[PDB]
C-alpha cells in the first residue's frame, strides 16, 4: 500500500492519541459551558487607544489595562444594534463559547462585562494583523506557506467539532497572526454548539457551502467546505467563487464547478476537489474517516501535525513589531466616542451575558 509497516504503525498510534486528547478536551470544556463566567471587569479599568476593526454592530479596540499595563483587544457591541439585527442568540453564543474553549490557535477571552449601552469582550491582543492584510499585500502564499496555516485550521476544527461546536465564519479577515507567526482565530459571532444540525443563514457569501445556500439544515461539513475556500484563496490570491452580486456568487457555488490556477499542484487540486465537494456524502471531513481523510491527504504529507500543535515548526514569516502597543500591522479606522447611556438598554434580552 502507500504506507509501510512502520508508517502504518505510527499513524494508528497517532490516531489513538488524538482520541485521548479530544476526550480530555471535551471534559474540560463541558464544565465551563454549563457554568459560564460573567462580570469580570468594567470599562474604566481600561484606557482605549485605537480601533483595530469595525463591524455592523460594534468595533474592536486596542486597550490598556490600567493596573496591569497589559494591552488587550476589546470588542464593544451596541446592545440596541444587536437586538436590531436579531443577533441576540449569536452574541450570547460567542461569549459562552469563548469563555469555555481552550486551544493554542483560539483567541483567549480575558474579561467580559456589560453596561447600559454595550456588551464588552476583552481578548488577548494579537499584534501581527489579519491574514487578510498580509495575503492581499503579498498577492498569494506559496503552497508550503498556505499549508502551514491550513494545518492550524484543520487542528482547530478537529477540536471545535469534537466539542459539538461549529465555527461558520472562516475567512482570512478572522485569522490573526501572532508574534510567533501562528494563527489566532478571532470572532466567534457565528460559532454555535450543535449536536445534530443547525439552520441559520449566516456566514460570508464567498465561503458559504451549497447546503447553506439551498436553505437546508447543515452541520460541521460547512466548515470543511469553508476550509477548501480558504486554502484556494490563500494559494490563488482570490476565492474560487466571486462576483459583484452575492446572488451570482451563490449560483457559482451550487453549480458544482471550480477552476484552478495553472500553478496549483495536482496534490492541491485533488484535496480542494474533495473539500469543495457539493455532495455532502462525499466531502472530506464528513466521511467515515472524519478529519483523517484530510490529515492523511498527500498535500499534507510533509505536515508534522503534533509539531504544529506544539508550535515547534518555524513559521513562514514573523510579523514586524516595534513595541507592545504597535498597531502598524492593522489598518486605520475612523474613531468614534463611546457613549454609555443614562438608561439601561435591552436589559432583559442580555440577562445571560
Amino acid at each position: 500500500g502507500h504506507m509501510g509497516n512502520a508508517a502504518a504503525a505510527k499513524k494508528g498510534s497517532e490516531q489513538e492519541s488524538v482520541k485521548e486528547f479530544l476526550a480530555k478536551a471535551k471534559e474540560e470544556f463541558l464544565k465551563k459551558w454549563e457554568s459560564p463566567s460573567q462580570n469580570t471587569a468594567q470599562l474604566d479599568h481600561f484606557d482605549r487607544i485605537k480601533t483595530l476593526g469595525t463591524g455592523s454592530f460594534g468595533r474592536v479596540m486596542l486597550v490598556k489595562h490600567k493596573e496591569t499595563g497589559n494591552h488587550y483587544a476589546m470588542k464593544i457591541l451596541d446592545k440596541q444594534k444587536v437586538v436590531k439585527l436579531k443577533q441576540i442568540e449569536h452574541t450570547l453564543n460567542e461569549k459562552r463559547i469563548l469563555q469555555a474553549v481552550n486551544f493554542p490557535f483560539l483567541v483567549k477571552l480575558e474579561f467580559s462585562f456589560k453596561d447600559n449601552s454595550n456588551l464588552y469582550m476583552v481578548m488577548e491582543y494579537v499584534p501581527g494583523g489579519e491574514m487578510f492584510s498580509h495575503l492581499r499585500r503579498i498577492g498569494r502564499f506559496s503552497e508550503p506557506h498556505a499549508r502551514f496555516y491550513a494545518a492550524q485550521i484543520v487542528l482547530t476544527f478537529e477540536y471545535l467539532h469534537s466539542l459539538d461546536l461549529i465555527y461558520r465564519d472562516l475567512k482570512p479577515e478572522n485569522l490573526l497572526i501572532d508574534q510567533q507567526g501562528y494563527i489566532q482565530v478571532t470572532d466567534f459571532g457565528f460559532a454555535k454548539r450543535v449536536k445534530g444540525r443547525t439552520w441559520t443563514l449566516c456566514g460570508t457569501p464567498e465561503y458559504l457551502a451549497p447546503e447553506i445556500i439551498l436553505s437546508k439544515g447543515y452541520n460541521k461539513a460547512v466548515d470543511w467546505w469553508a476550509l477548501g475556500v480558504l486554502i484556494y484563496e490563500m494559494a490563488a490570491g482570490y476565492p474560487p467563487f466571486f462576483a459583484d452580486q452575492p446572488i451570482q456568487i451563490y449560483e457559482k457555488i451550487v453549480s458544482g464547478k471550480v477552476r484552478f490556477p495553472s500553478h496549483f499542484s495536482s496534490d492541491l487540486k485533488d484535496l480542494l476537489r474533495n473539500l469543495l465537494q457539493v455532495d455532502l456524502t462525499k466531502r472530506f471531513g464528513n466521511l467515515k474517516n472524519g478529519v483523517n481523510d484530510i490529515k492523511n491527504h498527500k498535500w499534507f504529507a510533509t505536515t508534522d501535525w503534533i509539531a504544529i500543535y506544539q508550535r515547534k515548526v518555524e513559521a513562514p514569516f514573523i510579523p514586524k513589531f516595534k513595541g507592545p502597543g504597535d498597531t502598524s500591522n492593522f489598518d486605520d479606522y475612523e474613531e468614534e466616542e463611546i457613549r454609555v447611556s443614562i438608561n439601561e438598554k435591552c436589559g432583559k434580552e442580555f440577562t445571560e451575558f
Partner: peptide, 18 residues
C-alpha cells in the same frame, strides 16, 4: 487574468457576514 478581474470587482475588501 482572473486576479485582475478580482481586483476589478467589488469583493476585494473585508467581507461583511450575511
Amino acid at each position: 487574468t482572473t486576479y485582475a478581474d478580482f481586483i476589478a470587482s467589488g469583493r476585494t475588501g473585508r467581507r461583511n457576514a450575511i
